[PDB]
Amino acid sequence: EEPLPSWNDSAARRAILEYVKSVTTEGSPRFVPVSERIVTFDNDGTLWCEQPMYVQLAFALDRVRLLADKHPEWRTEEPFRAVIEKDLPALAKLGAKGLTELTMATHAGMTDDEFENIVTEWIRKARHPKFHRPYTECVYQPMLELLAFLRQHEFKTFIVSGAGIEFMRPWAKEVYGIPPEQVIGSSVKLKYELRDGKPVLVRLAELNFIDDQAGKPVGIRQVIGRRPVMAVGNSDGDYEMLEYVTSGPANGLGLIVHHTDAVREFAYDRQSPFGRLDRALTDATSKGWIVIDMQRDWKVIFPES
Amino acid sequence: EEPLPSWNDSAARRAILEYVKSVTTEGSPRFVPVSERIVTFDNDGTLWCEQPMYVQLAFALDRVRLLADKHPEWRTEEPFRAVIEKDLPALAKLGAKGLTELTMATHAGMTDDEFENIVTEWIRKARHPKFHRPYTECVYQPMLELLAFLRQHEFKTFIVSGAGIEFMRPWAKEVYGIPPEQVIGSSVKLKYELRDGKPVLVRLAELNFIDDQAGKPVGIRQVIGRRPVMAVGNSDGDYEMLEYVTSGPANGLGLIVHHTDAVREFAYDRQSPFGRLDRALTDATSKGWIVIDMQRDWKVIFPES
Ligand SMILES: [Ca+2]
Ligand SMILES: [Ca+2]
């Protein structure tokens, strides 16, 4: 049909269409005013691919390798040692905090614009080792359809990710239709100064915020100032975001992207170092969280090139 | 004329109309794509009245008075002593940091929703000691017109204030047409938990962010992810915000609300404990900042009741 053409008939497609209709039709008992139609998405594993590692970790790896010729101490200092020796099991222990700390330690003292240029150049030159396309083409076509569908019904679509806010902001508008003011992520602190008479923001070697696990409802409440009426995630790091939206007196809709398709994408859940999905999957039924089976529910995974 | 009906012919009205036309007309050399049309306003002294004190300070005063029966130590502990003894000169030393610390110390341990209810009840019951109307009716009608005019031309209007984000969010949408996700302010840290099975955010006795002076470009860059193309302020605390927008290679528009009208509002600048305007006023000409003379440039100050 017209809406969600890459989605087969499934629990998830039925729930999405029913819910959006119910909250946007004047006179419906569940009608939500346009201004309150906030929906939050994780990025890694929800909107795009996160195997064999988080894309920002791939970026951090290349950056460390490029910088390593000035750092004899990195042959022994963690996590740089793991990065240099290509030790993927060690790197899986970083999490959101470790990933932003690694990025923080390697890009302090430069401006926001300098960092953006670095990210932009990397994300157009690097490619996925499996798909041999830019990482920004390893986005999920069915989720692009979902984003458009929601925006057509006057939802504001936000990203709420553990990844670095400034890693996603350079390309999220072009790729997802999501502007920088609707991207929430982990961050370092900034300092204002003038350089050559030019006002700039400079990155500090200090953490500002880690937007994962119980951090997600905090990031949402601080930045958006509203409880979202819908949320989509894929891992146990999304548990609190989904709960905040769906549980107690709130009656919002939560969905989980379940990676079940080893042929067209990757199959993983409870054992995965990246995007581990276990506790949230077990509790889905009791919470009313609707699970998207990628293998069965999506007609295509990625957009045509 | 149709646009800005409460604005007389003035440098400010000419600059606003010219600039908005220039950046929103297809084919103009200064055309700014719709997605980039970000404008930032201070609140206190820019959108509404801040004499005889910041409205949030009035709120904090009432809250301290209500709570004082449980705090024998407040007879000696500052700033509570000053609040109790009605010592306005001492209270003028607080600034944005002190104001948020005072609010932080008196509302820790309650939920975001509990705090919102407290603010909402106060702001509808309290009244300005001069105008004898709710503080939310002591907003500037010409600025309401400016906000509408900008939104009609597809600008996104943000507040960027030193005051508490959660003090403004309960009423800013109704009063200014600005939703919570477009309010930037000072804040305390939050913690996620469940209370009676209900997911909530709880206020901590810990500062998160102070959004004043050189903090304003930081708050803007972190939350919005964009340099605004226009900004309006009124005090020296807005200097960095205006500079960030107008100076160096950026060529945005900055305006300053100058309180020159003692008859219809308040007259103050260089000597005022609240909304002190001195360094920014002296530098306005050199920066290209356009000064709004309230006495001469505005046909009315407040909306009709
Ligand atoms: Ca994820
Ligand atoms: Ca001000």
Side-chain angles (χ1 to χ4, degrees), chain A residues 2-305, chain B residues 2-305:
Chain A
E2 276 288 345
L4 307 185
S6 294
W7 297 66
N8 291 322
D9 187 20
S10 71
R13 199 186 69 182
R14 290 191 290 277
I16 290 165
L17 295 170
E18 185 160 46
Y19 186 75
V20 171
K21 191 166 294 302
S22 182
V23 304
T24 65
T25 310
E26 289 184 28
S28 171
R30 307 207 281 182
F31 179 82
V32 174
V34 167
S35 66
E36 290 171 41
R37 298 181 195 167
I38 303 309
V39 57
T40 54
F41 294 84
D42 197 7
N43 187 34
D44 297 331
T46 292
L47 296 180
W48 75 342
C49 187
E50 64 183 346
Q51 298 294 340
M53 62 185 85
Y54 304 132
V55 175
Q56 188 178 340
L57 187 53
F59 165 81
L61 266 49
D62 285 349
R63 295 297 299 162
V64 166
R65 288 191 196 102
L66 186 64
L67 295 165
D69 67 314
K70 304 295 173 57
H71 290 277
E73 80 283 10
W74 286 356
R75 294 199 177 85
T76 50
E77 190 187 342
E78 298 298 347
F80 306 97
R81 190 284 314 167
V83 176
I84 291 167
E85 300 190 351
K86 311 171 187 175
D87 190 344
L88 195 49
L91 295 174
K93 311 300 180 182
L94 287 171
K97 190 171 197 278
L99 174 62
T100 286
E101 288 175 328
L102 177 58
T103 306
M104 174 197 74
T106 51
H107 298 83
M110 75 175 59
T111 67
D112 57 337
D113 287 350
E114 285 166 347
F115 185 73
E116 176 178 353
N117 290 341
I118 286 167
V119 169
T120 296
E121 290 299 280
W122 183 85
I123 209 147
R124 71 174 197 74
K125 293 179 182 193
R127 79 180 184 174
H128 196 284
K130 187 179 161 81
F131 305 111
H132 290 164
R133 300 167 70 174
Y135 288 103
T136 51
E137 288 179 26
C138 302
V139 297
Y140 305 140
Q141 172 65 33
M143 299 296 288
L144 299 185
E145 292 169 12
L146 177 57
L147 288 166
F149 176 69
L150 293 166
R151 289 193 293 256
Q152 287 163 15
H153 291 78
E154 306 194 76
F155 282 71
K156 291 178 86 153
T157 54
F158 284 77
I159 287 168
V160 184
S161 168
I165 196 177
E166 299 311 327
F167 184 73
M168 295 179 288
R169 276 173 164 168
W171 53 270
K173 198 189 88 90
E174 184 204 338
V175 173
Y176 297 136
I178 297 173
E181 68 274 19
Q182 291 177 23
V183 178
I184 295 168
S186 296
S187 58
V188 301
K189 292 191 193 297
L190 297 174
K191 172 185 65 172
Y192 178 80
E193 63 180 34
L194 272 58
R195 286 185 179 186
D196 270 33
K198 169 174 155 60
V200 302
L201 281 311
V202 177
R203 298 170 51 91
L204 304 180
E206 207 181 333
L207 289 179
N208 183 46
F209 189 74
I210 302 305
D211 185 49
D212 202 14
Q213 309 171 65
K216 291 197 177 193
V218 172
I220 288 164
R221 184 59 183 75
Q222 294 279 30
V223 173
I224 309 185
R226 298 174 176 286
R227 188 193 307 267
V229 304
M230 184 176 163
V232 188
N234 72 295
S235 78
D236 286 0
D238 295 309
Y239 194 109
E240 291 93 340
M241 173 180 70
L242 296 165
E243 185 173 64
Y244 178 53
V245 168
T246 66
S247 295
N251 274 160
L253 179 64
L255 298 110
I256 293 168
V257 180
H258 192 193
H259 295 257
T260 51
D261 196 337
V263 178
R264 301 183 299 166
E265 205 253 350
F266 294 89
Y268 61 95
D269 43 44
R270 300 190 194 272
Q271 309 285 59
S272 187
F274 300 103
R276 192 185 307 274
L277 174 60
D278 178 19
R279 308 306 174 182
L281 186 54
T282 296
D283 280 0
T285 297
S286 63
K287 295 291 200 176
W289 297 339
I290 307 299
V291 180
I292 301 156
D293 183 331
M294 287 184 52
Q295 182 190 36
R296 294 189 67 81
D297 298 350
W298 286 355
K299 295 186 200 286
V300 300
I301 306 302
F302 305 106
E304 294 196 334
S305 51
Chain B
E2 276 288 345
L4 307 185
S6 294
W7 297 66
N8 291 322
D9 187 20
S10 71
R13 199 186 69 182
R14 290 191 290 277
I16 290 165
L17 295 170
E18 185 160 46
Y19 186 75
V20 171
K21 191 166 294 302
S22 182
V23 304
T24 65
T25 310
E26 289 184 28
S28 171
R30 307 207 281 182
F31 179 82
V32 174
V34 167
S35 66
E36 290 171 41
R37 298 181 195 167
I38 303 309
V39 57
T40 54
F41 294 84
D42 197 7
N43 187 34
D44 297 331
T46 292
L47 296 180
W48 75 342
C49 187
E50 64 183 346
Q51 298 294 340
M53 62 185 85
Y54 304 132
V55 175
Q56 188 178 340
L57 187 53
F59 165 81
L61 266 49
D62 285 349
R63 295 297 299 162
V64 166
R65 288 191 196 102
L66 186 64
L67 295 165
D69 67 314
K70 304 295 173 57
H71 290 277
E73 80 283 10
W74 286 356
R75 294 199 177 85
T76 50
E77 190 187 342
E78 298 298 347
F80 306 97
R81 190 284 314 167
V83 176
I84 291 167
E85 300 190 351
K86 311 171 187 175
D87 190 344
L88 195 49
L91 295 174
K93 311 300 180 182
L94 287 171
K97 190 171 197 278
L99 174 62
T100 286
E101 288 175 328
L102 177 58
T103 306
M104 174 197 74
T106 51
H107 298 83
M110 75 175 59
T111 67
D112 57 337
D113 287 350
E114 285 166 347
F115 185 73
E116 176 178 353
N117 290 341
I118 286 167
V119 169
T120 296
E121 290 299 280
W122 183 85
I123 209 147
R124 71 174 197 74
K125 293 179 182 193
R127 79 180 184 174
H128 196 284
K130 187 179 161 81
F131 305 111
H132 290 164
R133 300 167 70 174
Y135 288 103
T136 51
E137 288 179 26
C138 302
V139 297
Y140 305 140
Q141 172 65 33
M143 299 296 288
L144 299 185
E145 292 169 12
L146 177 57
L147 288 166
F149 176 69
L150 293 166
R151 289 193 293 256
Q152 287 163 15
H153 291 78
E154 306 194 76
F155 282 71
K156 291 178 86 153
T157 54
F158 284 77
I159 287 168
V160 184
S161 168
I165 196 177
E166 299 311 327
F167 184 73
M168 295 179 288
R169 276 173 164 168
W171 53 270
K173 198 189 88 90
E174 184 204 338
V175 173
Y176 297 136
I178 297 173
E181 68 274 19
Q182 291 177 23
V183 178
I184 295 168
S186 296
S187 58
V188 301
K189 292 191 193 297
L190 297 174
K191 172 185 65 172
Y192 178 80
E193 63 180 34
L194 272 58
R195 286 185 179 186
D196 270 33
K198 169 174 155 60
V200 302
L201 281 311
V202 177
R203 298 170 51 91
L204 304 180
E206 207 181 333
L207 289 179
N208 183 46
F209 189 74
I210 302 305
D211 185 49
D212 202 14
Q213 309 171 65
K216 291 197 177 193
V218 172
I220 288 164
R221 184 59 183 75
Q222 294 279 30
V223 173
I224 309 185
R226 298 174 176 286
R227 188 193 307 267
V229 304
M230 184 176 163
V232 188
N234 72 295
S235 78
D236 286 0
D238 295 309
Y239 194 109
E240 291 93 340
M241 173 180 70
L242 296 165
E243 185 173 64
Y244 178 53
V245 168
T246 66
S247 295
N251 274 160
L253 179 64
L255 298 110
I256 293 168
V257 180
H258 192 193
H259 295 257
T260 51
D261 196 337
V263 178
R264 301 183 299 166
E265 205 253 350
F266 294 89
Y268 61 95
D269 43 44
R270 300 190 194 272
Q271 309 285 59
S272 187
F274 300 103
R276 192 185 307 274
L277 174 60
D278 178 19
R279 308 306 174 182
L281 186 54
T282 296
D283 280 0
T285 297
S286 63
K287 295 291 200 176
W289 297 339
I290 307 299
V291 180
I292 301 156
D293 183 331
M294 287 184 52
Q295 182 190 36
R296 294 189 67 81
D297 298 350
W298 286 355
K299 295 186 200 286
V300 300
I301 306 302
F302 305 106
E304 294 196 334
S305 51

